[PDB]
Design a binder for this molecule. Structure first.
Ligand SMILES: Nc1ncnc2c1ncn2[C@@H]1O[C@H](COP(=O)(O)OP(=O)(O)O)[C@@H](O)[C@H]1O
Ligand SMILES: Nc1ncnc2c1ncn2[C@@H]1O[C@H](COP(=O)(O)OP(=O)(O)O)[C@@H](O)[C@H]1O
Ligand SMILES: Nc1ncnc2c1ncn2[C@@H]1O[C@H](COP(=O)(O)OP(=O)(O)O)[C@@H](O)[C@H]1O
Ligand SMILES: [Mg+2]
Ligand SMILES: [Mg+2]
Lengths: 371, 172, 371, 187, 172
C-alpha cells in the first residue's frame, strides 16, 4: 500500500502520496465560523468552513488558526482539518494508508501523544510515524551533512546534522516566523494611514507581505535610499479597488528576522542563532557545517535573504572558512519532499508505529520509537 | 473520583459565537452551546495521565464533538430511565461542572444563549443531557421558569413624539 | 513665559495654561455652517460658527466634526478651531507662548507632521511638542507604573508603563468610543418610536446618553429586571417640550464597550483588551500592572463601570492576584491635568522643538523628538 | 532544566525567566539515590510531583524534572559532554596520588559550594565512591551545613592567622615586578 | 607600534543596546557608542604583554569608562590645537581602528546609532574624539550630512483609503 505524508504546518497544510515529487493538496489551515446573523432560509445552513472555502468567504467569517507557534491549541478544529485533508482533498480512506506527520523540535510532549491518539482512535490509521521537520528537509537535498534553518509560519528552528548523527544539545528554537512578520507589517502599515484589524484584513496584509517584501543586503543604506527618492515605492490594489503604496516598509518587515528587538523580543537574529548553534558542535565538524547551510520554509523565499544570511555569517565566521548557503527554488516544499522520500525508502518499513504496538504500550510509545 | 483535575483559564472564550450570529435563522442553540461546554472541560497537561485518560473517554460519550453520535445519544436520552448506566454516568458530570473554577463565567455565557438564541424555549421539557448540564451551572434550576422577556405593547410611557423629520410630513 | 496645553480631543477641546489645576476653556469641537437662505438683512451673518456659539444655533446649522477616530480630516475646519482657541477662548497671542499638543498612539505620521507645520507657520509659535495622551494621564495620577486605559470620543487605547518604561509592542488601540455609542443609542431609540437623523438631534441624543446611561454589573440579570417591572424607566424632556421615557436602553448602550459585536465590530471588549495588553508584557511586571489600572477620558464616567471592569478582569486573571481599578473623580480632565504638570517640569524644558530646529530639519523633526 | 521544562509546555527564553527557572531548581530539585528506580516511580504515580507559583500567578507542576536536572552532575552525557561524572572525576583524582595516602583521602571527602546543597547528594556521592573504591576502605562524606559559604569562611580564617601576614603582595613589590608577580608569589 | 593586535570576534556584540532603548527619553547615544567602541578594541591574551599594556594605557587615556573622565576629556578637547600629544594619540588610535577586522560591523553599528538614537545630530559640529573615530569606521566622511530621514507631507499617495473599521464610523 502507498504511504501518506501530511505536514500540518502552522499556516499551511501539505499532503500527498509517498513517491510523488510535489504535494497534491495545499490549503491554508484556517477554520472559520459566521459572525453575522443569517436572514435567507435554505442558504445559511453550514456551521464552519475549512481551508480555501474559508478564504473565499472570509468577508463574513471569523478566521481562526488551529496552530499557534507549532503547538496545537484547538483540538476540535484540528480534527476538522485532518478530516478535510483525508476526505475532501485526497479522497482516500485513512484506514487503508499509513501516515507520516511532522513536528518541530523541542515541542511539548503532550502535543505528539495526542496526535498519536487522534490518529489511532478517531481515524484508525494502520500505522503512523512522527518526524522532525528539519531532519526531513535535509533528505530532500541529497546530503547527509549540514545545518538546517527551517522557518515556517510558527517556528524557526536549527538542527545541525553531521554524517547522519544529530547533536541534540545544539538544537536551537525560536518563536519568530511568518505570522509575527505579518503582525509587524500590520502594525507599521498604520504609519501611512492604512488600518487593518480584522482576520480577513490580516489575510490581506499577509498577501501583501508575500508579494511586495524583500530583504535588504545593507539596511542603513537601503533606508537612506528609500528616504531620498521614490524608486523603491510600489503599488498594490486592495480587493475593493482601493490602491495602497508602501515605501521602506518593504524591507523593514523582513528585517525583524535579523533584529528581533523590533517586536519586543530579546532573542538574537537568525544569523546569530545559526552561528551559536554551529559553535556548540564539536570542533572537527564546524568546517563542514559552514559549507552546508540548508534553508527551507515559506519564510525563507524573501528575495535576497540568502545573500544577507551569507554576508552575516561571513562577518561572524573566521576568514579562512568558506560559507555556502544552499537555497533550492523548491524550498517551500523541502520538508514535504523529504517526508515523501523517507516514507518511500525500503529501510523505513520497519520503523512504523503499528496499531498493535500502540495498544500494548499506549500513547507513550511515540516517545520511544521517534526522535 | 476525579480529584486533582485542572482546567485552562480561558480555553472557552474563543468558542462562543458572535452575539449577532445568535440571531441567525438556521442557527443551533444546543449543539453550539454544548461545544462551548465541551471545550471548557478539556483537561490540561498538568492533570496526571491516569486521571486525564478517564475523563476524556467519558466526555467523548456524553459531550461528543460529532453530530451523528449526538443525535443517536439524544434518541436514547429522552427515555433515560431505561439506561441506568447513563444516569450514573451523567451524575458524575454534575459534580465536576459545579466544581469548575470558571463556573460563573460559563453561567453568564449560558444565560446569553437563553436570552437571545433561546435554548431553554421548552422551559421544562428540555433534553435530559441538556437540562442536567444547566443544573450544574445554576443549582436553583430556575431557568425552567422563564428568561423574563419584555412586552410593551401597552407602552405605559406612550410617546407620540414628533421630531424634525416627522414634522416635515405629518397627517391630520 | 507661560506654556500652553491644548488637548485636541475628538469630541472636546481642552485648553489652558501650564500650572493651572483645570482647563480654562472647554468647548465642543464642531464647526457649523448654515443650511438655509437668509432673508433678513441688517444683522450680522457669519459663514461659519465655532464652539459653543455653534451649539446655540444648531437648529439652523449643519455641524461637522473636524476630527474622526483620532485623526484630523478637515484641515481648514481644524485651523479655524485653533484660531478660535488661541484668540477667542484664551485671549492670547500664540507667538509668545509655547504650545504642547496631544495625540493618540498609532496615528498616521502625516497627522502629526501637519500639526507641526500649521503651528510653526500659520500661528508662528516659538516651540511645540507632541505627547501621547495615555502617558499624560499617568502623570496626573501621581504614579510611575501601571496600565492606562484612556477612552475619549474617538479612540480607546491601552499603554502599559513600568517604572517610566513603556512597552510599545503591548500598546492596544480600538476605534470604539463615545461617538460610536451615541450612534448606537440613536439607533436603538428607534425601537420606541424616537427618530433622530439630523446632526442637531445627534447632540440631543449625546446629552441623553450622558445624563441617563449606566453600566450594569450583570447584563443578564439587569435585562430580566427591566423586563419585569418599570423600576428602571426614567424621563427626559426634549427642547421642544416633548417628553421621552426609556427603559432597558439605559444600560444596553454602554454594554457595547464589553460586547463590541453589537455594532458589528469583530474586536473584543475593553476588559479583554486590557487583559490582552497585560499578557504581552514581561512576566515579572504583571503583578504591579494588575493593581494599577488607571482610567481617564469621558467614556469612563459611566456610573458603575469601574465595578464592572473590576469584576471582569478578576475572572480572567488568576485567583492569587489582586485587581484594583483607579478612577479618580476628575478623570474627565486627567489628560489635560497631566499636560499642565509635564509642561511645568523644569527637566522637560530641554525637550521642546524650537523654531530654529524646525527650519533646519523640516516637519519630520517631530518624529525624532516626540515618542 | 530550561531545555527540559519545554516538555510540559512551559517556555522560558529571557534572562528574567532564567532567574525564575534557577529559583525553581534551587527550591524543588533533589538527587535521586537510584536514577533508574526513581524514574519508574515518577512514571508510575504522582507522589513526586510538586507545585510552584510563578511571579505572575500561574501555577506550574514538575515531575521527573526534579531529579533529572541534577543528574547531569553524574552523567554529563545529558548535555552532550564527553567528560565523566563528578563521582568518577573524584575517583580518578585520588588514583593520581601516591599509594600511601589513598586511605586518608577516602576518609575525608569535603564538599562545598551551592551546587552541592541538593538534598541527598552526599549519600549518592558516598554510594558511588564506595562502588568504585576497594571493599576494605571506609568512605566518609563530610558535608557541613554551612558549606554554601565554606570558601568565605576559609578566607576569613586564613586572613586572620598570624603566620599569613608575611605572604601579602604590596604596591611597592608591584611597582618593581609588574603584574607578573602574582604567579611567582601565589599558587 | 601596534602590530599583531588580535581581538575577540564578538566581544562588542553584547554591548550594543536594543533598538527600542535607543529612543529612550534619557539616552546618551555618545556614551553608549563609545562604550561599544571601547569593548571592540579590547586586547586579547594572544597579544604580547608590552604592546598590550601600552594600548591599554592609551585606550584608558582616550576612551575611559568613568563619566567624569569622559566629561573632562571632552571639555579639554574643545581647543585641541594646543595639545599636539592628543593629536598624535588620536592619530595612532585611528590607524589601529582603520585596520580592525570587524570594521564593517562597527561601521553599520555606527550608522544604526546615528539613525535611531541620533549619534551625530550636530552634522559636522560633533566632538573631535567622535569625529576621528567615525572617520576611522567610515572613511568617506559622508556622516557630516546626516541620516537623510523620510517625509510624508509630500503626499506621494493621495491615500483616501477606507477599510472595514474605518467604513463604519465614516463622516460625510
Ligand atoms: N514568497 C514569499 N515571500 C515571503 N513570505 C512568504 C512567501 N510565500 C510564503 N510566505 C510565508 O511563509 C509562511 C509559512 O509558509 P510555510 O512554509 O507553508 O509554513 P509551514 O512551514 O508552517 O507550512 C506563510 O505564513 C507565508 O506568509
Ligand atoms: N457623565 C458622562 N457619562 C457618559 N459619557 C460621558 C459623560 N461625560 C462625557 N461623556 C462622553 O465622553 C465622550 C468623550 O469626552 P472626552 O473625554 O472629552 O473625549 P476626548 O478624550 O476625545 O476629549 C463624549 O462624547 C461624551 O459623550
Ligand atoms: N539550596 C540550593 N539547592 C540547590 N542549588 C543551589 C542552592 N543554593 C544555591 N544553589 C546553586 O548554587 C549556585 C551558586 O552557588 P554558590 O556556591 O554561591 O556559587 P559560587 O561558588 O560560584 O559563589 C547557584 O547557581 C544555584 O543554582
Ligand atoms: Mg512547515
Ligand atoms: Mg481625548
Amino acid at each position: 500500500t502507498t504511504a501518506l505524508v501530511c505536514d500540518n504546518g502552522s499556516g499551511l497544510v501539505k499532503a500527498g502520496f509517498a513517491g510523488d515529487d510535489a504535494p497534491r493538496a495545499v490549503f491554508p489551515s484556517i477554520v472559520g465560523r459566521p459572525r453575522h446573523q443569517g436572514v435567507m432560509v435554505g442558504m445559511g445552513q453550514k456551521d464552519s468552513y475549512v481551508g480555501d472555502e474559508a478564504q473565499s468567504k472570509r468577508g463574513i467569517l471569523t478566521l481562526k488558526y488551529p496552530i499557534e507557534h507549532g503547538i496545537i491549541t484547538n483540538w476540535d478544529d484540528m480534527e476538522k482539518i485532518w478530516h478535510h485533508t483525508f476526505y475532501n482533498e485526497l479522497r482516500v480512506a485513512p484506514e487503508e494508508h499509513p501516515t507520516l506527520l511532522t513536528e518541530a523540535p523541542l515541542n511539548p510532549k503532550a502535543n505528539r501523544e495526542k496526535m498519536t491518539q487522534i490518529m489511532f482512535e478517531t481515524f484508525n490509521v494502520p500505522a503512523m510515524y512522527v518526524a522532525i521537520q528539519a531532519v526531513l528537509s535535509l533528505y530532500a537535498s541529497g546530503r547527509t551533512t549540514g545545518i538546517v534553518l527551517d522557518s515556517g509560519d510558527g517556528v524557526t528552528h536549527n538542527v545541525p546534522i553531521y554524517e547522519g548523527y544529530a547533536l541534540p544539545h545544539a538544537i536551537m528554537r525560536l518563536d519568530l516566523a511568518g505570522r509575527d512578520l505579518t503582525d509587524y507589517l500590520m502594525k507599521i502599515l498604520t504609519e501611512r494611514g492604512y488600518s487593518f484589524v480584522t482576520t480577513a484584513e490580516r489575510e490581506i496584509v499577509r498577501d501583501i507581505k508575500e508579494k511586495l517584501c524583500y530583504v535588504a543586503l545593507d539596511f542603513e543604506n537601503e533606508m537612506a535610499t528609500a528616504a531620498s527618492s521614490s524608486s523603491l515605492e510600489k503599488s498594490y490594489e486592495l480587493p475593493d479597488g482601493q490602491v495602497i503604496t508602501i515605501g521602506n516598509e518593504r524591507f523593514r518587515c523582513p528585517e525583524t528576522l535579523f533584529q528581533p528587538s523590533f517586536i519586543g523580543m530579546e532573542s538574537a537574529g537568525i544569523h546569530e542563532t545559526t552561528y551559536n548553534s554551529i559553535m556548540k558542535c564539536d570542533i572537527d565538524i564546524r568546517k563542514d557545517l559552514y559549507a552546508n547551510n540548508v534553508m527551507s520554509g515559506g519564510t525563507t523565499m524573501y528575495p535576497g535573504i540568502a545573500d544577507r544570511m551569507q554576508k552575516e555569517i561571513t562577518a561572524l565566521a573566521p576568514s579562512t572558512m568558506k560559507i555556502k548557503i544552499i537555497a533550492p527554488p523548491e524550498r517551500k516544499y523541502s520538508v514535504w519532499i523529504g517526508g515523501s522520500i523517507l516514507a518511500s525508502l525500503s529501510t523505513f518499513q520497519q520503523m512504523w508505529i503499528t496499531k498493535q504496538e500502540y495498544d500494548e504500550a499506549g500513547p507513550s510509545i511515540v516517545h520511544r520509537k521517534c526522535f | 473520583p476525579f480529584s486533582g483535575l485542572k482546567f485552562k483559564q480561558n480555553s472557552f472564550l474563543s468558542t462562543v459565537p458572535s452575539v449577532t450570529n445568535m440571531h441567525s435563522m438556521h442557527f443551533d442553540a444546543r449543539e453550539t452551546f454544548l461545544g462551548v461546554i465541551r471545550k471548557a472541560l478539556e483537561p490540561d497537561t498538568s492533570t496526571p495521565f491516569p486521571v486525564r485518560r478517564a475523563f476524556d473517554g467519558l466526555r467523548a460519550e456524553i459531550l461528543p464533538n460529532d453530530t451523528i453520535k449526538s443525535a443517536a445519544l439524544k434518541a436514547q436520552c429522552s427515555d433515560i430511565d431505561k439506561h441506568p448506566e447513563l444516569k450514573a454516568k451523567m451524575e458524575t458530570l454534575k459534580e465536576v461542572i459545579t466544581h469548575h473554577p470558571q463556573k460563573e463565567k460559563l453561567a453568564e455565557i449560558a444565560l446569553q444563549f437563553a436570552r437571545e438564541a433561546g435554548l431553554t424555549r421548552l422551559k421544562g421539557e428540555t433534553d435530559y443531557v441538556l437540562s442536567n448540564v444547566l443544573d450544574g451551572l445554576i443549582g436553583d434550576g430556575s431557568w425552567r421558569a422563564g428568561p423574563a422577556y419584555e412586552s410593551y405593547l401597552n407602552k405605559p410611557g406612550v410617546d407620540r413624539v414628533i421630531t424634525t423629520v416627522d414634522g416635515l410630513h405629518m397627517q391630520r
